[PDB]
Paper text:
The bacterial flagellar motor is a huge bidirectional rotary nanomachine that drives rotation of the flagellum for bacterial motility. The cytoplasmic C ring of the flagellar motor functions as the switch complex for the rotational direction switching from counterclockwise to clockwise. The basal body is made up of the LP ring, MS ring, C ring, rod and export apparatus. Here, we present two high-resolution cryo-electron microscopy structures of the C ring-containing flagellar basal body–hook complex from Salmonella Typhimurium, which are in the default counterclockwise state and in a constitutively active CheY mutant-induced clockwise state, respectively.
Given the high fragility of the C ring, we examined several reagents as the media of density gradient centrifugation in the purification of the intact C ring-containing basal body–hook complex in the default CCW state from our previously constructed ΔfliCD strain of S. Typhimurium, which lacks the flagellar filament, thus avoiding effects of the filaments on purification of the motor. The cryo-EM density map of the C ring-containing basal body–hook complex in the default CCW state was successfully determined to an overall resolution of 7.4 Å. Local refinements of the LP ring, MS ring, rod, hook and export apparatus generated their high-quality cryo-EM density maps at the resolutions ranging from 3.0 Å to 4.3 Å. Initial two-dimensional (2D) classification analyses of manually picked particles revealed that like the MS ring, the C ring adopts a 34-fold symmetric architecture. In the intact C ring-containing basal body–hook complexes, the MS ring is more stable and harbors much more clear densities for the outer RBM1 subring, outer RBM2 subring and putative inner RBM1 subring, which are made up of 11 RBM1, 11 RBM2 and 23 RBM1 domains of FliF, respectively. In the previously determined structure of the C ring-free basal body–hook complex, 5 L1 and 5 L2 loops, which consist of residues G311–P331 and residues P309–N324 of FliF, respectively, protrude from the β-collar region of the MS ring to bind the surface of the rod for torque transmission. In the intact C ring-containing basal body–hook complexes, there is one more peptide loop L3, which consists of the residues G310–P322 of FliF and is also extended from the β-collar region of the MS ring, bound in a hydrophobic groove that is formed by the α2–α3 linking loop of FliE6 with the D0 and DC domains of FlgC1 and FlgC6 on the surface of the rod. Thus, there are totally 11 FliF loops that extend from the MS ring to bind the rod in the basal body for torque transmission. These 11 loops are possibly derived from the FliF subunits in the 11-fold outer RBM1–RBM2 subrings. The more stable MS ring in the C ring-containing basal body–hook complexes indicates that the C ring is also important for the stability of the MS ring during motor assembly.
Residue numbers in the entry:
A (entry chain A), B (entry chain h), C (entry chain g), D (entry chain f), E (entry chain B): 229 to 305, 353 to 439
């Protein structure tokens, strides 16, 4: 029931990422000379979070006060000195409440496998690509897939001649 | 259901960013001599936040007072001196409450992949572009995509001859 | 639903900024010899804010009083002196409450990409523009776009010959 | 909905400022020899403010009193002197409450771009204008646009020959 | 009843992972020259979790205070010294409540078995593959299956000639 809807959601996301990669990889490598497939680890767990933050007021310069009683006594007779300080302070503090409801269906970790073809010249020899072109393909695929390191995304692009 | 609506929202945003990039990249590079694709990491999490800020009043110059009782006693007989100061102060403080409801569907991180063609002169030789022109394309794409560093936007523009 | 309305709002704002830029850039550069595209980062977050400000009254010259009790005693017998001052003061303070509801749909950051053509004389040679003319175009575009530094606006105008 | 009404309001304000500038710039520069465009940053945020002001009464000359108790005692026996002064004062203070509801749709910052043509004499040579005439145009545009420094208004008028 | 639905859910997930692997393994190894099967250990246990986190306030620099009473007494007569410090502090602490409902049907551990064929040249000799090609197949399968180490995923790809 709901599981099938989630699976179809994942399939559509993967297909659209695949198409976005193919769109940029087509003009330079050529139609059919590139194949990519995407798998997506998604987030279907309902989470609700409330965050409370208090600004520190331990420093007297940023401390906000409402009432303060400072009783000071010094009975000098060091000799028979007698110092007494009774201090009472009531503070008002900065407060920030944030309520967050995470979206259901977010992407947790995306791994993408891309395979490119060789280059057959007018003679027909399948000449492999170069390192610079491979780096360009890797960068383009990283851009298309929305590659990020916080998610833990992995990308692998290899070059090999396609079968007949 | 709602996930499909969010996905269509993302697709429309990406398509419009793509079209905006293509619009400026067309007059100089030429029709079809430029291809770009956009992926968008969006924000579909409902967040509500209330912020409270208190202006500090620790300095006597900016401190606002309502009532103040200052009892001072000095019984000089340092000898048998006896100083006593009882101070009570009630303050009124500046207060700022901000209530914020973040919009659903905002952009978190935008990465854009752009590929340009080579230059075929009247002879037909695919002459590659220059560094200055590449920098101009990068700047134009950054302007079109709304490039920002707080979001974490990444842009990659590479030059390569298009396939037939 | 609402997201589409927000997107159409952004598109209309961007189109009108584009048209305003084109309107001034047309008479001097010429029809079609200028192309500009605008992207707008907008504010669709409902914010409500209440601000309270108290005027400081720590200086006796600007302090407003309602009731004041000053008991002073000096029993001179420094010898066996005995000074005692009990002071109680009730103040009235200036107060300013400001309630603000920010508009939904305001502009946060505007970045604009403008491209101009070269100058083809009667012979037909595409002569590039000059530095003074480029500075004039930059100033005119800044004026049209409502360029501001608090928002974080970025503008890029480059000169390049248009393709056929 | 409301955003479109606000945008149309901004467009009408900008168009009327443009027409006012054109009206004075026409008789001297000539019909069509002047083009101006206006952009307006407006205020669509509902603000409500209540201000309370108390006149200071720390000086005995401007202090208004309702009741005053002054107990003075001097038991001279400096010797065994004993001075005691108990003073209680109740004041009445001046008070001014101001309640302000700012208008929705006010102008925050106006920037205007104006371009003028060259002067083609009977021979047809496009003779540029002079510094005095440019200063006069700048002053007239500042007057028409309602130029102010508190708002942060910026004006740019440049001279360049119009294209065919 | 529900068990059959869960089993069909597992079968669909396994089939889609199998198809994703086959899709990338087809262009290089060839149609039919690759066979893969997937088994999935799934999560059909309903879990609900509430998390509470308190920011530490043991350091006086990050400690937020509401009321503080500090009575200090020093009766010097080390001699007959008498120090007494009574300190009472009330703190306000940061608080974060997270409520999480894990999705039913998540993947716990995925193990995948892939078998590839040999290479029969024009002569017909079944030449085995190379180490580099095997490593490429392993990497592609890891990318397709969403291989992760936290889950405990295991992958085994072996090379052997297919039977008639």
């Amino acid at each position: 029931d709901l599981n099938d809807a989630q699976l179809k959601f994942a399939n559509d996301v993967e297909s659209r990422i695949q198409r976005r990669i193919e769109a940029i990889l087509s003009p330079i490598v050529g139609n059919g000379n590139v194949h990519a497939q995407v798998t997506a680890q998604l987030d279907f767990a309902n989470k609700e979070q409330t965050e409370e933050h208090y600004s520190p007021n331990g420093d007297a310069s940023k401390a906000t006060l409402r009432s303060r009683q400072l009783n000071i006594s010094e009975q000098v007779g060091a000799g028979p000195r007698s110092t007494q300080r009774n201090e009472t302070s009531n503070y008002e503090v900065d407060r920030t409440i944030r309520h967050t409801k995470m979206n259901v269906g977010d992407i947790e970790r995306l791994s993408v496998a891309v395979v490119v073809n060789y280059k057959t010249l007018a003679d027909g020899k399948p000449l492999p690509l170069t390192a610079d072109q491979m780096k360009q393909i890797e960068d383009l695929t990283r851009e298309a897939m929305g590659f990020s390191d916080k998610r833990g995304d992995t990308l692998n692009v290899v070059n090999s001649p396609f079968s007949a």
